[PDB]
Coordinates of C-alpha atoms and ligand atoms in Angstrom, one line a residue:
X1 CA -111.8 127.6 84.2
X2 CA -111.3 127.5 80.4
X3 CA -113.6 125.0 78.5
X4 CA -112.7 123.2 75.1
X5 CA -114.5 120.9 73.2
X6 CA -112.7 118.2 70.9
X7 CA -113.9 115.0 69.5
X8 CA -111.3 113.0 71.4
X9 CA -109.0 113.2 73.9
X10 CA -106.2 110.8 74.0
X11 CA -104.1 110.9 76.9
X12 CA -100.3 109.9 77.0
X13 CA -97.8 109.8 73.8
X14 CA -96.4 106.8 74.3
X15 CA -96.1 103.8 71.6
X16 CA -99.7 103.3 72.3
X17 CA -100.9 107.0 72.1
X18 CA -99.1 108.5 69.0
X19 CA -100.0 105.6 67.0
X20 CA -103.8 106.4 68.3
X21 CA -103.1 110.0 67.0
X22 CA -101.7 109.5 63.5
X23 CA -104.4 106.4 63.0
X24 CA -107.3 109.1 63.6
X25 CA -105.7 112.2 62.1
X26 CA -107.1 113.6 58.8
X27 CA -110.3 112.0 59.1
X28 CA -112.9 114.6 60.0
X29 CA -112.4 114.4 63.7
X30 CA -110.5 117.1 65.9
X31 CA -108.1 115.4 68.4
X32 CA -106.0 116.5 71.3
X33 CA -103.4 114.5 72.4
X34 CA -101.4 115.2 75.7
X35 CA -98.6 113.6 77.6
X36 CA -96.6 114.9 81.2
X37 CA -93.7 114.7 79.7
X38 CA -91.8 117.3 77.9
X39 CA -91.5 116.4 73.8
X40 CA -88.1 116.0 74.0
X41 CA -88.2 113.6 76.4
X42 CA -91.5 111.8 75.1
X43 CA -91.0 108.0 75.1
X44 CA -88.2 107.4 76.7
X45 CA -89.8 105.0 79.3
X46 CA -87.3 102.5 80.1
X47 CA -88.0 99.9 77.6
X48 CA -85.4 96.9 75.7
X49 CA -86.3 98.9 72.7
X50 CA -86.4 95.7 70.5
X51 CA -89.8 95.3 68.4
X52 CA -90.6 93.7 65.0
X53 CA -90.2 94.8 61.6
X54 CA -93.8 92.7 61.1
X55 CA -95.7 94.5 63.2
X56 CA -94.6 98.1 61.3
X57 CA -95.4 96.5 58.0
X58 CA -99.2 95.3 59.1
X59 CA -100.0 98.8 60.3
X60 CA -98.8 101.0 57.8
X61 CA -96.9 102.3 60.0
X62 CA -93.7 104.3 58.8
X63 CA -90.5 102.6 59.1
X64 CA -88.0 103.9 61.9
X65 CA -85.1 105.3 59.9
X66 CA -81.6 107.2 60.2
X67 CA -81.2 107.9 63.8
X68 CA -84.4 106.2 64.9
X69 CA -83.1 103.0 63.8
X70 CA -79.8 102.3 65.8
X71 CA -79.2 98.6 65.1
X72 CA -80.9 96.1 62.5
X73 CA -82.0 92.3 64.1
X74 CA -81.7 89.3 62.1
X75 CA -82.8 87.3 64.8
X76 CA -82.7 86.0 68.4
X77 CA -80.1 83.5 70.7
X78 CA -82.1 81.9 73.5
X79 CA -79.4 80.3 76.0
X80 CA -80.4 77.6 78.3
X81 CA -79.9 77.8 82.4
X82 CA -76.9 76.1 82.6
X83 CA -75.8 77.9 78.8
X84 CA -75.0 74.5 77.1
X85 CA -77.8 74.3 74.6
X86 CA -78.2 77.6 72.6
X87 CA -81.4 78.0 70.1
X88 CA -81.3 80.8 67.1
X89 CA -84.8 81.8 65.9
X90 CA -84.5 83.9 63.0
X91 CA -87.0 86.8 61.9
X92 CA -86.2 90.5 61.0
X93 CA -86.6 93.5 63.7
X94 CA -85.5 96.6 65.0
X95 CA -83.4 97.9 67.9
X96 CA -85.0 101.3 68.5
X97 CA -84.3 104.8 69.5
X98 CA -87.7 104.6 71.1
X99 CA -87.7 108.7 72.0
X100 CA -86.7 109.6 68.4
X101 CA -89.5 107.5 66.3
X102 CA -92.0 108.0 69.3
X103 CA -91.8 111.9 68.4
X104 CA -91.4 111.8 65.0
X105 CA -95.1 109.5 64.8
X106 CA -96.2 112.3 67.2
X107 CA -94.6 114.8 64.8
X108 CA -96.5 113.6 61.7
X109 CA -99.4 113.2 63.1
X110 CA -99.5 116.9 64.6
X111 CA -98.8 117.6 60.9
X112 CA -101.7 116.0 59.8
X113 CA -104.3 118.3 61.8
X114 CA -103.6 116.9 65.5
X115 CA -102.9 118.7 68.3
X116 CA -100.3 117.9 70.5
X117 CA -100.1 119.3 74.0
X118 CA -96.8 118.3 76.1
X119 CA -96.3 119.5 80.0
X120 CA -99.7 118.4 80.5
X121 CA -101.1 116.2 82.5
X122 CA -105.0 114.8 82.9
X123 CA -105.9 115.3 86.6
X124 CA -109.1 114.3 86.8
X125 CA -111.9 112.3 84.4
X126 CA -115.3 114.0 84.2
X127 CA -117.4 111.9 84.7
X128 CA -121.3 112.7 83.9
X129 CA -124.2 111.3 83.7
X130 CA -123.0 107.7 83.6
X131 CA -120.1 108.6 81.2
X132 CA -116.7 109.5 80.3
X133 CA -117.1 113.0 78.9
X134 CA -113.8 114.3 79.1
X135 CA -110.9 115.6 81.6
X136 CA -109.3 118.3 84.0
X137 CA -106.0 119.1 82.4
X138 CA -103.0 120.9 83.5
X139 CA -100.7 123.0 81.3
X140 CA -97.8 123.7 82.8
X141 CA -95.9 125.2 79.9
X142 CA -99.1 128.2 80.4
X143 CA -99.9 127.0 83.7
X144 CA -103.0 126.7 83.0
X145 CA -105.9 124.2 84.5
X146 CA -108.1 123.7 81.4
X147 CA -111.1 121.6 81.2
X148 CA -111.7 119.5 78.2
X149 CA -114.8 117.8 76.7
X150 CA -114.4 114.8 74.6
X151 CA -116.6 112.1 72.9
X152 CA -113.9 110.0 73.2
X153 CA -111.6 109.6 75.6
X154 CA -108.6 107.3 74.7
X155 CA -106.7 106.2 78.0
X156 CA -102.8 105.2 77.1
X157 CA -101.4 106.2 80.4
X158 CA -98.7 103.6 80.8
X159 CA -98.6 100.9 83.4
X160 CA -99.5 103.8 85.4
X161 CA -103.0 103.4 84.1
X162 CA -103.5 106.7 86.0
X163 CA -106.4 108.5 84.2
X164 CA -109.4 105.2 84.5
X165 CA -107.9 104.1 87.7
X166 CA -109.3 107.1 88.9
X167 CA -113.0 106.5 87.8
X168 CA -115.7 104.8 89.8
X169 CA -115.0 101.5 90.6
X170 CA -118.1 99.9 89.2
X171 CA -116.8 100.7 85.7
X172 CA -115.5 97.1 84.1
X173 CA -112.7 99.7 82.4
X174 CA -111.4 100.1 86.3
X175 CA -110.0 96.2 86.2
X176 CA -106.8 96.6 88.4
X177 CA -103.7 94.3 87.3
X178 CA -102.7 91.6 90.1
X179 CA -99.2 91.5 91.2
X180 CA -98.2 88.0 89.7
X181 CA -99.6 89.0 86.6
X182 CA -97.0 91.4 86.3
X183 CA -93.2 91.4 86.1
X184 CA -90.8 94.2 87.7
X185 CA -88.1 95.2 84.8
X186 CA -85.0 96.9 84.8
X187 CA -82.4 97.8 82.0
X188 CA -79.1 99.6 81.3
X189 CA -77.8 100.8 78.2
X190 CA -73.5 100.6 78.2
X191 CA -70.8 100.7 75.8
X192 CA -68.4 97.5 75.7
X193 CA -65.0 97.5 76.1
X194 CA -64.4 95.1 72.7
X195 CA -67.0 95.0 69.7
X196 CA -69.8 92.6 70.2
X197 CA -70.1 89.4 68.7
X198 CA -73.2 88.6 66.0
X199 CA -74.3 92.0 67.0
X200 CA -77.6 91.8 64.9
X201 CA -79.1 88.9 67.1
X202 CA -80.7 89.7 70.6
X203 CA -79.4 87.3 73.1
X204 CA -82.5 86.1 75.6
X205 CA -80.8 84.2 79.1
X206 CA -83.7 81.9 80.8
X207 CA -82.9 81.2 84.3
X208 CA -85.0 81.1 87.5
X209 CA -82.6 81.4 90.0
X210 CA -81.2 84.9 88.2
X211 CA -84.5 86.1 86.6
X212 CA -87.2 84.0 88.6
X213 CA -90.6 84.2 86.5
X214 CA -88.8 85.9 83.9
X215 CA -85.6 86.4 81.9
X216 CA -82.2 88.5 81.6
X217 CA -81.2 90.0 78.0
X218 CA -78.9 91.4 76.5
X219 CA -79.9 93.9 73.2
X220 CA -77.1 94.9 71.1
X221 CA -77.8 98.9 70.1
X222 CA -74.5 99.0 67.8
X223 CA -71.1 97.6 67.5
X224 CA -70.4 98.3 70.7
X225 CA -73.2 99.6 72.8
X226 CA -75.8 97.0 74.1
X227 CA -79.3 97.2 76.1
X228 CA -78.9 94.7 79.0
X229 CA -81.3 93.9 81.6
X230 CA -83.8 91.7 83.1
X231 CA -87.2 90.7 84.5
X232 CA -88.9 89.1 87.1
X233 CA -92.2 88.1 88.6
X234 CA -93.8 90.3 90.7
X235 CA -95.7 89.5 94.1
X236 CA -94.0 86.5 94.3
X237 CA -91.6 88.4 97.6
X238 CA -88.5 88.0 95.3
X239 CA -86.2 90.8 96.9
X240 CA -85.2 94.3 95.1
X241 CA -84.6 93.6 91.2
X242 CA -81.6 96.1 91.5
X243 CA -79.9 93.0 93.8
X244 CA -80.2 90.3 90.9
X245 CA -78.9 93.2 88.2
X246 CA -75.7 93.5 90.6
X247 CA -75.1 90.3 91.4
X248 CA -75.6 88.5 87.8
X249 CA -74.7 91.0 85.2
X250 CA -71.2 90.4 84.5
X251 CA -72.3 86.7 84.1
X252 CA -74.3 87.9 80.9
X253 CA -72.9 91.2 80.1
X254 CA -68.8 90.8 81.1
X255 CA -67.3 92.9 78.1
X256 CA -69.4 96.2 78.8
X257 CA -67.6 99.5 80.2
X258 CA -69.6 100.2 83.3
X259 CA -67.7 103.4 83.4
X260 CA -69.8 104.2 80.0
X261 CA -73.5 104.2 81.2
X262 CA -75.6 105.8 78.9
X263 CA -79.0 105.2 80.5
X264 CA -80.4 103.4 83.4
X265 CA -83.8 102.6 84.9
X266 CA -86.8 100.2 85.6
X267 CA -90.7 99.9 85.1
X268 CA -93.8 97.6 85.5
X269 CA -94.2 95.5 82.8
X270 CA -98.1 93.6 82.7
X271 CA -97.6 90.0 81.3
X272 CA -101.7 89.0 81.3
X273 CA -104.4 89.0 78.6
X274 CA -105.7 92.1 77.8
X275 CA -108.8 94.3 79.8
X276 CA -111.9 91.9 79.9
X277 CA -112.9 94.8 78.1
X278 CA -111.1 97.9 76.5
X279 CA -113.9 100.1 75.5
X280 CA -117.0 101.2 77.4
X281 CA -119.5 104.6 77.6
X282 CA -116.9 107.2 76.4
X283 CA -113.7 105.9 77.0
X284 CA -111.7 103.3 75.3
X285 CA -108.1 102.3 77.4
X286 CA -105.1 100.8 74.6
X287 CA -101.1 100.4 75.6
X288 CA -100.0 98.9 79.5
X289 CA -102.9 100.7 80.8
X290 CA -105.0 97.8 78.9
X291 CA -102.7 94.9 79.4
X292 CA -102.0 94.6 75.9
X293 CA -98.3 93.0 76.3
X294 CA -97.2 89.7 75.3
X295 CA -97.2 87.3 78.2
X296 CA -94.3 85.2 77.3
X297 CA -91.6 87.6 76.2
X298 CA -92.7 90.6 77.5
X299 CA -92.9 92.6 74.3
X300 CA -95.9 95.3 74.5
X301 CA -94.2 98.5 72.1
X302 CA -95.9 96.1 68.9
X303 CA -98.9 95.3 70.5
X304 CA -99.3 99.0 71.6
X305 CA -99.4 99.9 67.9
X306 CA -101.9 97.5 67.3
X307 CA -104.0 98.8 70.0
X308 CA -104.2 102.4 68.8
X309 CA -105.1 101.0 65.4
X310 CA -108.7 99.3 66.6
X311 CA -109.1 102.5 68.6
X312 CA -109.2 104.4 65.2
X313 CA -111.2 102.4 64.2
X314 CA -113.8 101.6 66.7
X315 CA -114.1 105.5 67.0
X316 CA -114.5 106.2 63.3
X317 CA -117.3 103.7 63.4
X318 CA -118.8 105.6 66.3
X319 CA -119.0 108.8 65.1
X320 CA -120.2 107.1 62.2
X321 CA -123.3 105.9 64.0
X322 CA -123.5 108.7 66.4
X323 CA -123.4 106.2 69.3
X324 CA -120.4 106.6 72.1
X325 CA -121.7 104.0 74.1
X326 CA -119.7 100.7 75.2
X327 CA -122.0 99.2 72.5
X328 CA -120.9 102.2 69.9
X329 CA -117.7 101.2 70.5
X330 CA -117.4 97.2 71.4
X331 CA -115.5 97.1 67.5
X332 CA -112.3 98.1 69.9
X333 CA -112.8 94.8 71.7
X334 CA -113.4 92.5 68.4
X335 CA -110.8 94.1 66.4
X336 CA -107.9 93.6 69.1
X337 CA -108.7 90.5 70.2
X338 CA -108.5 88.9 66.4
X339 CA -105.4 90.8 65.6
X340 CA -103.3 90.0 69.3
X341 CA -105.8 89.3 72.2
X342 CA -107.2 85.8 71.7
X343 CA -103.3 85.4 71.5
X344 CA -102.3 86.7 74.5
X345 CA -104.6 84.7 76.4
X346 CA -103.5 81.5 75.3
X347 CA -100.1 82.9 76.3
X348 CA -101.1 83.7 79.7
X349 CA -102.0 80.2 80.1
X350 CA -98.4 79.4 78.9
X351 CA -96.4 81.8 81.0
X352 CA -97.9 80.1 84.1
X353 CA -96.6 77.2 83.1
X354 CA -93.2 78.3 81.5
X355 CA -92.6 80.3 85.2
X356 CA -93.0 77.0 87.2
X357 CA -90.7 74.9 85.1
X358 CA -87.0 74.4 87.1
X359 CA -83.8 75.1 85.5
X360 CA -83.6 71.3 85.4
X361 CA -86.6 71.2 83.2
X362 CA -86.1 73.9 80.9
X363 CA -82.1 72.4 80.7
X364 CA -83.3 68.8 79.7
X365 CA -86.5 69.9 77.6
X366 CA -83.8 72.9 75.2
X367 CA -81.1 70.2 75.0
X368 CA -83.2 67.2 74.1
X369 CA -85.2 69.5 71.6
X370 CA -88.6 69.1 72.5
X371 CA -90.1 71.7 70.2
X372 CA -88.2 73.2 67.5
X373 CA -87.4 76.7 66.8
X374 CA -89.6 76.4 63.9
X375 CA -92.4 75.3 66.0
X376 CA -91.5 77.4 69.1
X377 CA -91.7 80.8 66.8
X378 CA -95.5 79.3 66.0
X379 CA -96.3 79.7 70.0
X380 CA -95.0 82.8 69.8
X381 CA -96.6 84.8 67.0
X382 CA -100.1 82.7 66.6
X383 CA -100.3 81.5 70.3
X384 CA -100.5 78.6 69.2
X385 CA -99.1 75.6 70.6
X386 CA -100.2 72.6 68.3
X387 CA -101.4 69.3 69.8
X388 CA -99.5 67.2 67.1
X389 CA -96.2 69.3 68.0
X390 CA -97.3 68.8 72.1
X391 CA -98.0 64.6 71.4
X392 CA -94.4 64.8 70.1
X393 CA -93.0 66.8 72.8
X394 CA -94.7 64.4 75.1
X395 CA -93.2 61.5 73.4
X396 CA -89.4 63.2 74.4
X397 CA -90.8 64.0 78.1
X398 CA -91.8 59.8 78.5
X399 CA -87.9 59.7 78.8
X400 CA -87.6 61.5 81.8
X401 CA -87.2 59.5 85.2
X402 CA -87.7 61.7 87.2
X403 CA -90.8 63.7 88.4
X404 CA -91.3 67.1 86.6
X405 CA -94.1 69.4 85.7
X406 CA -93.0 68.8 81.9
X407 CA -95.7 65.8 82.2
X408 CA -98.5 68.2 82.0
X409 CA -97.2 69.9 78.8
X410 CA -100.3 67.9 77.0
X411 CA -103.1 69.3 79.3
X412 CA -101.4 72.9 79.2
X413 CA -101.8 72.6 75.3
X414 CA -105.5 72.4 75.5
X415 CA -106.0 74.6 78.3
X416 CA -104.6 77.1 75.8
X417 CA -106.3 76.0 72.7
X418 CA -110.0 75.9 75.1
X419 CA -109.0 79.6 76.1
X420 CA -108.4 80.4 72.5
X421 CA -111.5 79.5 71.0
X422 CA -113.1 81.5 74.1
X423 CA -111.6 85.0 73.5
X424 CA -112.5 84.0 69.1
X425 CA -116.2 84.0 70.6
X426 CA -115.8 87.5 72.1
X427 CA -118.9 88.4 73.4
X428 CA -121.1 90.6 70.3
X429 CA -122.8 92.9 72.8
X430 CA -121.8 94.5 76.4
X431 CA -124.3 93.0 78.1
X432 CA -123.0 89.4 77.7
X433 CA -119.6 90.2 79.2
X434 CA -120.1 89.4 82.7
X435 CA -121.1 86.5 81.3
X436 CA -118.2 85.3 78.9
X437 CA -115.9 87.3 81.6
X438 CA -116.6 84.6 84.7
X439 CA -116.2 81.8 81.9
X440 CA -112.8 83.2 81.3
X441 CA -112.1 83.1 85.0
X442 CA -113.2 79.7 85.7
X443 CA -110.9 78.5 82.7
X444 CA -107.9 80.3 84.5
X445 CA -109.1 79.0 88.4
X446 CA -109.0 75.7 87.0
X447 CA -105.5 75.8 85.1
X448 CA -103.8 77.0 88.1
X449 CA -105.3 73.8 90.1
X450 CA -104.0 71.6 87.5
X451 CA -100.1 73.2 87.8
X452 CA -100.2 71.3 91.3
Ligands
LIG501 C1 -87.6 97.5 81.2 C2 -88.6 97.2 80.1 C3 -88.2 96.6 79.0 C4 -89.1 96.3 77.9 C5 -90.4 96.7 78.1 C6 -90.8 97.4 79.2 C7 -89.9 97.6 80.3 C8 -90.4 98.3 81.5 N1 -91.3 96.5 77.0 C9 -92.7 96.9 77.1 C10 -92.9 98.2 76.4 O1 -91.9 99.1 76.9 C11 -94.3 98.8 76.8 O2 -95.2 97.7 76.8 C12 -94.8 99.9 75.9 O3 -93.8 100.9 75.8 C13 -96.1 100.5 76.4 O4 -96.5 101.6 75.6 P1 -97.5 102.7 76.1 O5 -97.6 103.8 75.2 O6 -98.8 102.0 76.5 O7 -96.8 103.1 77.5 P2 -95.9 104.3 77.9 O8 -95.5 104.2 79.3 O9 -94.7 104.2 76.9 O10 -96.7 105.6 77.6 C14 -97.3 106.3 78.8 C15 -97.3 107.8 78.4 O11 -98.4 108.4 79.0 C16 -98.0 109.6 79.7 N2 -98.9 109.8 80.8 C17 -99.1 109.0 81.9 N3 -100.0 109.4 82.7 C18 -100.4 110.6 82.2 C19 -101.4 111.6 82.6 N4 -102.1 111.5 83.7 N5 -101.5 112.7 81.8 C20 -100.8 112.8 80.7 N6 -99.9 111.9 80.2 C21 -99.7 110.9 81.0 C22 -96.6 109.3 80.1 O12 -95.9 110.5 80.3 C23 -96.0 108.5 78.9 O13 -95.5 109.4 77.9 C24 -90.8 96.1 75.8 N7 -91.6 96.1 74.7 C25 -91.1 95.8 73.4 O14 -91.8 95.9 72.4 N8 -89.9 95.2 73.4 C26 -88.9 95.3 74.4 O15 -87.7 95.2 74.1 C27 -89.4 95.7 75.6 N9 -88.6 95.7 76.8
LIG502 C1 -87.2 92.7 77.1 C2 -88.7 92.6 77.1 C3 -89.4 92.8 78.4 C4 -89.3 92.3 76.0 C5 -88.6 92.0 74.7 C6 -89.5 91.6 73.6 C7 -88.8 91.0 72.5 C8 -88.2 89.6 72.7 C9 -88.7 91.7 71.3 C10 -88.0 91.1 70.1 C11 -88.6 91.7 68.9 C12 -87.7 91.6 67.7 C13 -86.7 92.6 67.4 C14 -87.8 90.4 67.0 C15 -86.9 90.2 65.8 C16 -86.6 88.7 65.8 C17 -87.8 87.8 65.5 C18 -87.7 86.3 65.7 C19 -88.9 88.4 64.9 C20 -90.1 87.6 64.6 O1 -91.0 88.4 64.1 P1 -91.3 88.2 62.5 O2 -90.5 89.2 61.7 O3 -92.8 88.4 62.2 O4 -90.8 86.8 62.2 P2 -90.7 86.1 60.8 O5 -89.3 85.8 60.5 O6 -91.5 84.8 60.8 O7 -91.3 87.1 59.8
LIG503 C1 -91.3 83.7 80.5 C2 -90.1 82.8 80.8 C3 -90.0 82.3 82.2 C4 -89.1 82.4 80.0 C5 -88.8 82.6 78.5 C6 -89.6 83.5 77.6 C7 -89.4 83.1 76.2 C8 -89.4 81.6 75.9 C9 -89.3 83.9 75.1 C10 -89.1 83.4 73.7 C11 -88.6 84.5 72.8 C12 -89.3 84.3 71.5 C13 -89.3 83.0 70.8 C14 -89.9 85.4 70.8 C15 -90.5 85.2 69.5 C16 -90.1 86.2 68.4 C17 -90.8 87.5 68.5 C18 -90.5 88.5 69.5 C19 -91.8 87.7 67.5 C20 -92.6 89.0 67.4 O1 -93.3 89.3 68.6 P1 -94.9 89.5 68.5 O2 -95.2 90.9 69.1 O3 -95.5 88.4 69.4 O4 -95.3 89.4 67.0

């Protein structure tokens, strides 16, 4: 078959993989980039479509405008189970046309010297002499079966992960994603039969007997169109996520036009700190296909960006030093876990705890205030969760009478600040990851002890 040589290969155009591409382009490197999909269609995964305007503005990343940009978010409504105490976080975002800026990110950067291949899809990794050296492709647009030899390959498959998962299981880049560190998600975009009220804030519904281990939402696109859906915990033996959309949607969306369905659709959404590592010899994975989404709200089209950004990068640096090791390019691992990964381990820790909380408990702890908005935005953007702000959360939970795993909210506090300073001492070199990795794990074992 054909042969062709690039200096990377990223495969997959998602949020994740076109931010890859326009991060590397003009830079003295040649790049492919392919996806399975067909451009027109490239990025329209089902997805809530909601990110923040901060992560665009960290990146220098281009703004999503005109049709791109279908609705503007001043800020969030988080309704408690029984929907008597209703919190409003405030912070600017964007309700996206996630297949319009996807392509246009894809678009620029193909103007800036990248080449873009759509229709094809990476069958199989070569993999010689201990590394990643490239892929099998398949063009279907020429129908052609190319093979293609990188230095580089970025994996941002999805939560398919279907490129590394099919490498040698010996590889630390083969870490597989357990079921309960996941959540099943499903959405549906509608118009409403009258305008929607406060249509610039997201409305967020937390409830375990509707969304167990997760949440339902409800993502105004408009004046009258509106992203509703939910998730769920997986490998917990909850039945079909289709049953609780049927059965609970018009308590949460009872003004849309079910006769105006627009869209419709559900995919696996990981809620777990990233890959113990995302780089090694010749390959460096970024997106869902790393685990780079946040834990607690499920929000991973931010952190995707982010992701492609180290990748730049981490490869930059080594081509710089002529070294495609792990080692060559372990900057992927220290840049992402400084700019979102030491977070999202401290919010694993959390979501294990916020999952096993009862409607009772999230119900008394919303209405009796025991963190603020203010403070709960802090958890949610740093990962922090302060152990003056949990002493005074404790101080509301001594009023309880009842038994409750809101007791513990102390020892979850510095399970997550512990885990913290544990991923801000990211091993320097590969060879101390096994290491740091099965410190990681103990840290986790012993958290999900304590939650009993
Ligand atoms: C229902 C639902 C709702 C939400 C969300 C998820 C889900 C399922 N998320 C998460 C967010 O959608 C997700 O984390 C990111 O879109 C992940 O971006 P990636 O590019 O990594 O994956 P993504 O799946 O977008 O990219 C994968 C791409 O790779 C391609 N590909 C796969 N295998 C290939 C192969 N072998 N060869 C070639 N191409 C291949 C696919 O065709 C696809 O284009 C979210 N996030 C957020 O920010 N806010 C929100 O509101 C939500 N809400
Ligand atoms: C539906 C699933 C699975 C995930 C959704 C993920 C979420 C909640 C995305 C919301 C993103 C968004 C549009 C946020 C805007 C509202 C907000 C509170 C943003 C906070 O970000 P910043 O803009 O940095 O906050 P500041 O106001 O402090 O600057
Ligand atoms: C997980 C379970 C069971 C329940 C609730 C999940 C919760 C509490 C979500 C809170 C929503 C929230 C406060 C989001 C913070 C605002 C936001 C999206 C900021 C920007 O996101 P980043 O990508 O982290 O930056």
């Amino acid at each position: 078959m054909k042969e062709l040589k690039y200096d990377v290969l990223i495969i997959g155009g998602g949020f994740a993989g076109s931010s890859a591409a326009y991060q590397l382009s003009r830079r003295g490197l040649k790049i492919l980039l392919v996806d399975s999909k067909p451009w027109n269609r490239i990025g329209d995964k089902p997805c809530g479509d909601a990110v923040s305007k901060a992560h665009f503005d960290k990146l220098g990343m281009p703004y999503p405008k005109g049709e791109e940009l279908e609705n503007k978010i001043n800020g969030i409504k988080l309704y408690s189970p029984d929907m008597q105490t209703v919190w409003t976080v405030n912070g600017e975002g964007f309700e996206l046309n996630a297949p319009l800026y996807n392509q246009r990110v894809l678009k620029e950067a193909q103007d800036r010297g990248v080449e873009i291949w759509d229709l094809t899809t990476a069958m199989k990794p070569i993999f010689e002499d201990g590394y990643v050296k490239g892929a099998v492709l398949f063009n279907r647009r020429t129908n052609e079966e190319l093979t293609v030899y990188s230095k580089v390959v970025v994996e941002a498959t999805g939560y398919s992960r279907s490129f590394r998962s099919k490498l040698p299981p010996e590889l630390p880049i083969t870490e597989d994603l357990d079921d309960k560190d996941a959540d099943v998600a499903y959405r549906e975009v509608l118009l409403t039969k009258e305008d929607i009220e406060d249509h610039d804030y997201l409305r967020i519904f937390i409830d375990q007997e509707t969304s167990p281990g997760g949440y339902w939402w409800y993502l105004p696109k408009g004046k009258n169109k509106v992203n509703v859906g939910l998730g769920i915990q997986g490998g917990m033996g909850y039945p079909s996520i289709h049953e609780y959309y049927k059965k609970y949607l018009d308590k949460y969306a009872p003004d849309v036009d079910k006769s105006k369905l627009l869209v419709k659709g559900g995919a696996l959404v990981p809620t777990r700190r990233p890959l113990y590592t995302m780089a090694w010899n010749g390959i460096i994975v970024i997106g869902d296909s790393g685990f780079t989404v946040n834990p607690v709200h499920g929000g991973g089209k931010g952190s995707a960006m982010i992701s492609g950004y180290c990748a730049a990068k981490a490869i930059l640096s080594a081509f710089e030093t002529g070294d495609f090791s792990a080692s060559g390019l372990w900057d992927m691992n220290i840049c992402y876990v400084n700019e979102y990964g030491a977070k999202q381990a401290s919010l694993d820790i959390f979501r294990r705890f916020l999952q096993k909380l009862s409607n009772d408990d999230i119900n008394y702890g919303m209405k009796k205030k025991i963190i603020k908005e203010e403070d709960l935005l802090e958890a949610s953007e740093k990962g922090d969760l302060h152990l003056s702000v949990a002493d005074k959360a404790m101080r509301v939970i001594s009023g309880l009478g009842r038994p409750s795993l809101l007791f513990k909210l102390k020892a979850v506090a510095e399970s997550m600040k512990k885990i913290k300073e544990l991923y801000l001492n990211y091993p320097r070199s590969p060879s101390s990851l096994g290491s740091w990795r099965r410190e990681v794990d103990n840290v986790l074992t012993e958290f999900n002890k304590s939650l009993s």
